[PDB]
Write a protein that binds this ligand. Structure first.
Ligand SMILES: CC1=C(CCOP(=O)(O)OP(=O)(O)O)S/C(=C(/O)CO)N1Cc1cnc(C)nc1N
Ligand SMILES: CC1=C(CCOP(=O)(O)OP(=O)(O)O)S/C(=C(/O)CO)N1Cc1cnc(C)nc1N
Ligand SMILES: O=C[C@H](O)CO
Ligand SMILES: O=C[C@H](O)CO
Ligand SMILES: [Ca+2]
Ligand SMILES: [Ca+2]
Lengths: 620, 620
């Protein structure tokens, strides 16, 4: 636990290691013909000191739950990440030369198919948020001794998501977290705004609550000392470096970002760098203290059935909070995150019952998603984050990268559609189905009553990938019995007869408007089938087609969402070309406006009267 | 012009005005049954001083180009915005009571159907970026004397987009910009992280380069004085306020965000506030100096036809930069913005030729979009912002709000799809068609060669709404004659014969793969029709169906995009139910990986061999 103050031999070995890391970064990117060697070279001493002096980890078990965590937020320096894991003996040295090949897993940016990578990076400014999740988990959930280190670029610090993470770490006193800023003066296409004004970086980090240390980022001794001292708050090591450090004629120059060295130049430069290496002997990693606890990864089952009764009124946003609090008694791994909307999403119910597992993320949706991704790494927790569904559009790049990170997180977005009424369109989610359907690992739950909501929470907890649950503001009636069985990809026919003339597909508020339309139409001797998809992705194609073939081939979809990328388009894409099938589509055709929920459902053509009129037009 | 130091009577009139604004905010939200009176009341002295001492504007012409700008970033305080414009005499006082009604345009959050609103707010943290665009336009494009004032909440300051804007304003020395921070201690569901630690707010603003003044936010005199001194930096007025100020029993209390007062309570409170008002006499607005220049509104035309030659190879990303620079020579209204990717998007070509109209936005996509929106307000410029298409997912909420703002901005996203090759999925746009198609005011151009790209740039410049141009990395052949006419919503058949067996729809790289598949299939005596959509939204439904009817009803769509929300789903939704029509869909089915462009097109089943295989299977 004491700092091991290095002797001159250890320091020289760390210098030798940094220069081996430079050589490998050049060799690999020259072999591939693409990549970012100058972005690797500015970080070589940082990487050497982190992996061969400061960090504690099992070199043959990178995912080990007791290990210190390292997050390469500037993911385009991937070649030097691969180099340190070869230096540590986990990766074969020859495999480094296969960088970016389709036959290799040493891809252009780090990805979790690599045992030594927890989260994919490559979209800049997201790594510190994931690191914050890891550090929060280590400090407050695992209560373990591992530390979390996150390496960022200086151009990267222009992303606002970075400063959300900065503020989060000081709010939650993440003294097990270290951010290393590679201040190499240059971005991709020009100098970074602050260049080498190290004092301004220090002032910005200190103002956001971090202990900020300016170092020479090419001095292994200064780095050892800065990493070695006792942290009392999150610590920023602000490293003055030169891009392309060690590449004569390229160091500190523009026009070299993302440019590999040609073969002839690489050979010449590598010879120069090799001439600076005093010994070929490698430093061994040091293993960690093994005090992370065991976690139960068994299937998660609710402690009881839903306790609703058919006919009761409840909004699915309220049923979400009730179900999430219940799920917290079913599993110690459930955590909840919310962005200052807990009284609107009803995640406050979970907070009241399991306060130690609720994370207030404040008005910072991008960081909230990144925190959840970090908390889910190494399967330590099962996160549920919530806000208005409209404000998950603020975090789309984090959600996109979460799928590239093969992350298992759960997202519940409330206040979907025009049915929220008077707040108007800034608060109305009308594109969230399009957004989440386009996320490749996603399961999109759209529960239509309190029972389906509780069942969706339970299923989501046990489902891999990006799970989205779309909840609603109107109080609608319970239509399912408490022992109704639900499955991902299985729809429900909630009204049927042998004389059905259309299959009407609705969800949430428009399922209840479709049931109301069915009652109106029965007064004119017109029966319609009503189908509740339950999951919009994956869609129950078979039940939709079987239903349509029983209703003259006619499908009518109605949704509180824009036309593009929603339920209607999913249904059309599923059935196109099937003989005799037709699909009519009712949705929201433009930016809405303020009014009462029923007034807006009418104005935008997705209420019971619009459904009934569409049905009549189909019959004639 | 000299500061007019107000006498005690002017100060009392400002207090009277602030209290009238309180009363109206309460009356309107109690009448509506919803809204945020406590969020209005903390800002009442700020609003009174801004509109009736500091700002200069035409009270009867809120959109006038010489006016100072006000941006209500904390948009849920809309009732007090409406109240000031009634106090200034633009809005009928009686209409305030119709807040949030479907019969009114005084909607729950501000929207540009209101003459006094430039940008919609309601999604927190976006107003300051729009204000930065307005102030940049005022200082460097209009070169006018108007100033820009932006009111933010304190919970709102947790959004990273705010700090991107803070940094932008100090980089570009926006000394015509003032941010007012309503530090009323409380957010929606808890105190804001910093509560009333005014010194930490000051340190954060100063560290980001702003002149920061702490004031008593309920002192009209301190506010007059703080607003009355211009600076050489953007200026942050950090106002210590109490939420619900002036509402006895509610001031400084939790559990009141977004809660209207019940009628009995509102009547009692209003009588208390009215007893503090010394005179009914209203202050008059003071008009501005009229030095904003005229701006032309005419159609913008390229100075000449494209000058490519059929058979030449150019990537559409390079054609974009060439076309944008060319268009810059025809109209001085064109401005370009980029997020440190100008050497990759080729917006660097525009920077080289028109440096005064290029805005480097650094690695901050959310702010870049907001800057563009701000620059486009009052039609002052025609902005084109660019980055990798994948990183526009970082700005989806800003793009969403831009459509609610009825903004005319142009966005070009490069590096779409797996065809970028070795960088891997973090850089691959595979959901951008889904995202932009879901934006209700959007036109989505997907040019397949350099000619189409230049035509798309010209069309986009003259098209209202959110225009997206998807560009690509591969260097594909010019296929169109320079004099080919292009229109929004009109596709092109680029290969046909009388014996065509399938209509293959591709775009960008998959159009060229389709053309290569056609050559492979001709060896097998199989002709295919090949169709280039040009715009994905709106889709040329008629040409698609006419083509399909000439090819035995068979359509095959192939796209470098995920399955959901892209070209295939757009086509399927357009043609579903049409007799005899079938649609086969080839797209990317999961998160990709690194490899050569051609290897990834093959791996993910969208190359010439996958297309030919699908055609051979259809014909059987
Ligand atoms: C602009 C940019 C880079 C420059 C980073 O400069 P830096 O100072 O943070 O790091 P180094 O100087 O250490 O290189 S790396 C890069 C890529 O596309 C490659 O991922 N991009 C485009 C990019 C833009 N926006 C986002 C969100 N992610 C990105 N990866
Ligand atoms: C959390 C939140 C508000 C609290 C604002 O606190 P503040 O301190 O900035 O302002 P005041 O204290 O001055 O009210 S107003 C609000 C709404 O949905 C209403 O638009 N929301 C949800 C919200 C969440 N995220 C975003 C991006 N926008 C939002 N509007
Ligand atoms: O009351 C409902 C509001 O929409 C959020 O609490
Ligand atoms: O060509 C290399 C990168 O893709 C951008 O220029
Ligand atoms: Ca840099
Ligand atoms: Ca506040």
């Amino acid at each position: 636990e004491s700092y091991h103050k290095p002797d001159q031999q250890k320091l020289q070995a760390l210098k030798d290691t940094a220069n081996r890391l430079r050589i490998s970064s050049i060799q690999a990117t020259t072999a591939a013909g693409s990549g970012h060697p100058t972005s690797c070279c500015s970080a070589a001493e940082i990487m050497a000191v982190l992996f061969f002096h400061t960090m504690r980890y099992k070199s043959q078990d990178p995912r080990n739950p007791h290990n210190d965590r390292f997050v390469l937020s500037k993911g385009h320096a991937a070649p030097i990440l691969y180099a340190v894991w070869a230096e540590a003996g986990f990766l074969a040295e020859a495999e480094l030369l296969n960088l970016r090949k389709i036959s290799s897993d040493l891809d252009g940016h780090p990805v979790p198919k690599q045992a030594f990578t927890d989260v994919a990076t490559g979209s800049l400014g997201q790594g510190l948020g994931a690191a914050c999740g890891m550090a929060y988990t280590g400090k407050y959930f695992d209560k373990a001794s591992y530390r979390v280190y996150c390496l960022l670029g200086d151009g990267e610090l222009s992303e606002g998501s970075v400063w959300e993470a900065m503020a989060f770490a000081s709010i939650y006193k993440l003294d097990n977290l270290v951010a290393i800023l590679d201040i190499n003066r240059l971005g991709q296409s020009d100098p970074a705004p602050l260049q080498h004004q190290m004092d301004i970086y220090q002032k910005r980090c200190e103002a956001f609550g971090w202990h900020a240390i300016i170092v020479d980022g090419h001095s292994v001794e200064e780095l050892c000392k800065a990493f070695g001292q006792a942290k009392h708050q999150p610590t920023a090591i602000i490293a003055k470096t030169f891009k392309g450090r060690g590449i004569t004629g390229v160091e500190d120059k523009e026009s070299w970002h993302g440019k590999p060295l040609p073969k002839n130049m690489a050979e010449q430069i590598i010879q120069e760098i090799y001439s600076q290496i005093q010994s070929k002997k490698k430093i061994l990693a040091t293993p960690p203290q093994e005090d992370a606890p065991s976690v139960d990864i068994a299937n998660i089952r609710m402690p009881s059935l839903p306790s609703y009764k058919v006919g009761d009124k409840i909004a699915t946003r309220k049923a979400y909070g009730q179900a999430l609090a219940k799920l917290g008694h079913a599993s110690d791994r459930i955590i909840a995150l919310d962005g200052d909307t807990k009284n609107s999403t009803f995640s406050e119910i979970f907070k009241k019952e399991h306060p130690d597992r609720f994370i207030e993320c404040y008005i910072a949706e991008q960081n909230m998603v990144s925190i959840a991704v970090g908390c889910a790494t190494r399967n330590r927790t099962v996160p549920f984050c919530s806000t208005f569904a409209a404000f998950f559009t603020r975090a789309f790049d984090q959600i996109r990268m979460a799928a590239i990170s093969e992350s298992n997180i759960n997202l519940c977005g409330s206040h979907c559609g025009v049915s929220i009424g008077e707040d108007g369109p800034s608060q109305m989610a009308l594109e969230d189905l399009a957004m989440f359907r386009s996320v490749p690992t996603s399961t999109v739950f759209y529960p239509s009553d309190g029972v389906a909501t509780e069942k969706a929470v339970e299923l989501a907890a046990n489902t891999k990938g990006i799970c989205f649950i779309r909840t609603s503001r109107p109080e609608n009636a319970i239509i399912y019995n408490n022992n109704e069985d639900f499955q991902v990809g299985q729809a429900k026919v909630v009204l049927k007869s042998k004389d059905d003339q259309v299959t009407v597909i609705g969800a949430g508020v428009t399922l209840h408007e479709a049931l109301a339309a069915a009652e109106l139409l029965k007064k004119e001797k017109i029966n319609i089938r009503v189908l509740d998809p339950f999951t919009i992705k994956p869609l129950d194609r078979k039940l939709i087609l079987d239903s349509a073939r029983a209703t003259k081939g006619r499908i009518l979809t109605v949704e509180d969402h824009y036309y593009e990328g929603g339920i209607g388009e999913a249904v059309s894409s599923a059935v196109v070309g099937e003989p005799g099938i037709t699909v009519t589509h009712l949705a929201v055709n433009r930016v809405p406006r303020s009014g009462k929920p029923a007034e807006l459902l009418k104005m935008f053509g997705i209420d019971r009267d619009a459904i009934a009129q569409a049905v009549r037009g189909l019959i004639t």
